[PDB]
Design a protein around this ligand. Sequence first.
Ligand code: RKJ
Ligand code: RKJ
Length: 130
Amino acid sequence: SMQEEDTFRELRIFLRNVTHRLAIDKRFRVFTKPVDPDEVPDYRTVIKEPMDLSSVISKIDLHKYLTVKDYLRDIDLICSNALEYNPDRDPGDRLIRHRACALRDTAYAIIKEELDEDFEQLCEEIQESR
Ligand SMILES: CCN1C[C@@H]2C[C@H]3c4onc(C)c4[C@@H](O)[C@]2(C1)N3C
Ligand SMILES: CCN1C[C@@H]2C[C@H]3c4onc(C)c4[C@@H](O)[C@]2(C1)N3C
């Protein structure tokens, strides 16, 4: 219905605003673009599903997310990819792990404080009806 298309349009506006706010924080600059396969040819042999904040904005615009749950699965993949690729005790590794955990906690805290529980339940019921 037209009312259902208006629901999904409101969801995309909300997700773009969350994602752009994460993308301007100086801590998260390393997550804003894909890993350059030149500089890091090894990356794509270890990490099977690369993900970054530029890719997330492209996916919103292609209508790939019908719920906040499916968006948070991509935020979780940005974080898990950084933890898996950089697991060592050295400071470079420890700094990117700390930043990855901060990105995930920041996204969850914005959504907890700014999404109504009933808007997300409506998106999940339209999704399950398709
Ligand atoms: C050129 C200096 N490198 C330091 C970082 C460690 C590792 C990494 O893991 N996730 C991302 C994103 C990145 C890149 O920022 C990075 C580039 N590497 C491929
Ligand atoms: C319980 C009634 N809700 C009204 C508000 C609308 C929306 C929202 O957007 N930013 C913030 C902050 C808030 C919350 O205060 C709120 C709680 N919602 C999640």
